Amino acid sequence: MAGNSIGQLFRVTTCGESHGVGLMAIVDGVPPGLALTEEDLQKDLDRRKPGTSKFATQRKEPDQVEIISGVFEGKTTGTPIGLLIRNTDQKSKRDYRGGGRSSARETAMRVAAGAIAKKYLAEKFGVLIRGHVTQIGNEVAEKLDWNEVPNNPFFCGDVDAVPRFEALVTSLREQGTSCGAKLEILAEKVPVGWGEPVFDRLDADIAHAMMSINAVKGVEIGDGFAVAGQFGHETRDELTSHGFLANHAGGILGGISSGQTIRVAIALKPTASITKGRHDPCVGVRATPIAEAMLAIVLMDHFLRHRAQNADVVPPFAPIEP
Amino acid sequence: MAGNSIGQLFRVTTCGESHGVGLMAIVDGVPPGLALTEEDLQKDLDRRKPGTSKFATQRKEPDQVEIISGVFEGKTTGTPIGLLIRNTDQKSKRDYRGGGRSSARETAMRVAAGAIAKKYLAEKFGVLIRGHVTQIGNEVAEKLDWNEVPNNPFFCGDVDAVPRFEALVTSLREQGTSCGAKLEILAEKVPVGWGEPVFDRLDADIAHAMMSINAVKGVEIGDGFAVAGQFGHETRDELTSHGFLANHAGGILGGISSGQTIRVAIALKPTASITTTKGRHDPCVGVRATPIAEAMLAIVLMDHFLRHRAQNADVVPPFAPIEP
């Protein structure tokens, strides 16, 4: 029925049914003094729906999230933050409808919450966390231009691939199939040092975090499964070589963050058409916004767990941006 | 430092350095009445370095685990089970002093703890948790004969692939290299129902544990990453077709167990090496992670069994036992 909590010092606890009254989360351990309002959160929530009137037949409002506690005069107070989304199900106030869930909702509370972790890490450490689709069934995108990713509806970073992607889905929609997908999410500028071992390593906790996303059948950090093929060397005493900081570890070594960008990828499986018609076909490209929140949530928590461990902080000074 | 505990209802807490005095573990939630002794855990423990001798012609006896609590008269008392191993490192050329950090001691406590979950689950439900290697470097293994697996190092299940592994490893040693690895672990006869969504889905806790082993760079369940390129053409009517019941899900659907065998693969990377002494090379340590990968699967599954039972208040009834 649930294991509705995730996180230890930055923890999120959620409740709520899609056929139910509303959704909710109580998010813990956010330092005081971070600027925060609904809109901050809603940009993250709405990103699950790419396009200014792209989809379906008619438009909805949609359904706005509210901060019930934990912020004062635009900034966090350090106390637990309450988040509410009163589901507006067409019935409030002999054939009036009901049955259950249309549930982008199952993801609302976590996305909203991540939006907070997300912001704090940008605000404080200048951490960028963004993801993008790299594969849709038999189509792959090989270039990455971040500016392009919000242009198309596949969260795709290769302008050349957007059409091939747009071609495929079009077919699958009217052919009636659905296909797998591969998303890569990156965390740029994560301070070295975060992650607790053996058991709660940053990767370990990221994997567990990402798997909470339905339909994922695989998580891999860095080079990932490619790794089984590879033959080992980082270091030998030699005259000429190709550098180490092409990440094979993807930002995490031995459980701890290394300071280099953190690269994660997830694989989502094909879904279903249950019965009018929206036919997904890859409804797994929508995961991206929420892939982003999971990574953020783990990241934020391990930040605190790491701060939690110290009297004063030893080097390094390095390029300082808040 | 540490994040030294894992499990919620079946919990393991550990400590200890390899160079250190010893290693400890307090294991929680194991029901009473389970037959248990040291050797029951040593078996699993010793499996880490395959073959009787088979490295350098001889064995000094490996360090020994000791149950320090939680069993009485050969049966679990249902209290927290404590485990110990006093390292016996030798300076060579009263046991002091440490400096020797061996990446093998690091896994003893999970494997030891894992053994308990594995044993209990085997009895109670018949559940077999077996790992086996499917790729070393650029060598694969398609056939799987479980009887094959313990008859060679590499935990490999394909007899005709064994020599190819040997080939590549005996070669590599020479060259001073090392290669990545791919391991598949299967848990059979696990009852439908375990797993707690949203955050604690079984697949999520398994991924989390698999990632505890050094060198793991990814975890996948069911078909895994291949899933990215598949098309879900399912009549979803079971109209005449092949593969109506095939474990594309690897035994976990929606985060809960499906009743089917649970299949999980992890991939370990080529390892680093140091010394200015020469002669021992891994050259593929990945393979030795198999019994560890097993323990982790069991730990997680054991914890989820108890969480499912706990969550259930109109339980199905079996009465096969009696007590004095």
Identify all chain B residues contacting A268, using CB atoms and an 8 Å cutoff. Answer: 227-228
Q: Does domain A1-322 match CATH 2.40.50.140? A: no
Taking an 8 Å cut-off on Cβ atoms, the answer to whether A231 and B178 are in contact is yes
Sign of CA dihedral B88, B113, A257, A13: negative
Determine if residue B56 is labeled as part of a ligand binding site: no
Taking an 8 Å cut-off on Cβ atoms, the answer to whether A207 and B211 are in contact is yes
Determine if residue B103 is labeled as part of a ligand binding site: yes
Owner of token pair 């069991």: B298
Q: Taking a C-beta distance cutoff of 8 angstroms, is the pair A251, A258 a contact?
A: yes
CA distance B232 to B228: 10
Task: Decide: helix, strand or coil at residue A132.
Answer: strand
CA distance B288 to B268: 11
Q: Give me the CATH topology for the region B1-324.
A: Chorismate synthase, AroC fold (3.60.150)
Taking an 8 Å cut-off on Cβ atoms, the answer to whether A227 and B209 are in contact is no
Contacting B residues, span 276-315, partner chain A, CB-CB under 8 Å: 286, 311
For B196, the closest of A3, A201, A218 (CB atoms) is: A3
Determine if residue A254 is labeled as part of a ligand binding site: yes
Determine if residue A11 is labeled as part of a ligand binding site: no
Structure tokens at A276: 């009018």
Q: Taking a C-beta distance cutoff of 8 angstroms, is the pair A107, A290 a contact?
A: yes
- Residues with Cβ within 8 Å of A170's Cβ and at least 6 positions away in sequence, in order, are none
Closest chain A residue by Cα to residue B11: A199
User: Of A312, A309, A267, A270, which Cα lies nearest the Cα of A291?
Assistant: A267
Contacting B residues, span 206-225, partner chain A, CB-CB under 8 Å: 207-212, 214, 216-225
Interchain CB contact of A258 with B (< 8 Å): no
Q: What is the DSSP string of A242-276?
A: --S-S-SSTTEETTEE-SSPEEEEEEE--------
Identify all chain A residues contacting B105, using CB atoms and an 8 Å cutoff. Answer: none
CA distance B174 to B81: 45
Task: Decide: helix, strand or coil at residue A146.
Answer: coil
Helix count (H) and strand count (E) of chain A? 6, 14
Å from A114 to nearest chain B CA?
14
For B231, the closest of A209, A223, A270 (CB atoms) is: A270
Interchain CB contact of A158 with B (< 8 Å): no
Q: Which of A198, A216, A248, A271 to mutate to test the interface with B (most CBs of B within 10 A)?
A: A198
Closest chain B residue by Cα to residue A203: B211
Strand spans (E) along chain A? 5-6, 12-15, 22-27, 66-67, 71-72, 75-76, 81-86, 128-136, 139-140, 181-188, 216-221, 252-253, 256-257, 262-268
CA distance B151 to B166: 13
Closest chain B residue by Cα to residue A11: B199
Task: Decide: helix, strand or coil at residue A287.
Answer: helix
Technique employed here was X-ray
User: What is the residue extent of each domain of chain A?
Assistant: 1-322
Give, in order, the Cα–Cα distances in Å from B92 to each of A19, B22, B146, B160: 70, 19, 41, 42
For B5, the closest of A199, A223, A273 (CB atoms) is: A199
| Cross-strand partners of A231 | B179
For A204, the closest of B199, B212, B268 (CB atoms) is: B212
Resolution of the PDB structure in angstroms: 3.2
Å from B41 to nearest chain A CA?
20
Q: Taking a C-beta distance cutoff of 8 angstroms, is the pair B295, B44 a contact?
A: yes
Determine if residue A214 is labeled as part of a ligand binding site: yes
Interchain CB contact of B133 with A (< 8 Å): no
Q: What is the DSSP string of B53-68?
A: S-STT--PPP---EEE
Contacting A residues, span 42-71, partner chain B, CB-CB under 8 Å: none
Instruction: Fill in the amino acid letter for B259.
Output: G
Determine if residue B276 is labeled as part of a ligand binding site: no
CA triple B286-B289-B294, angle to 5 deg: 145
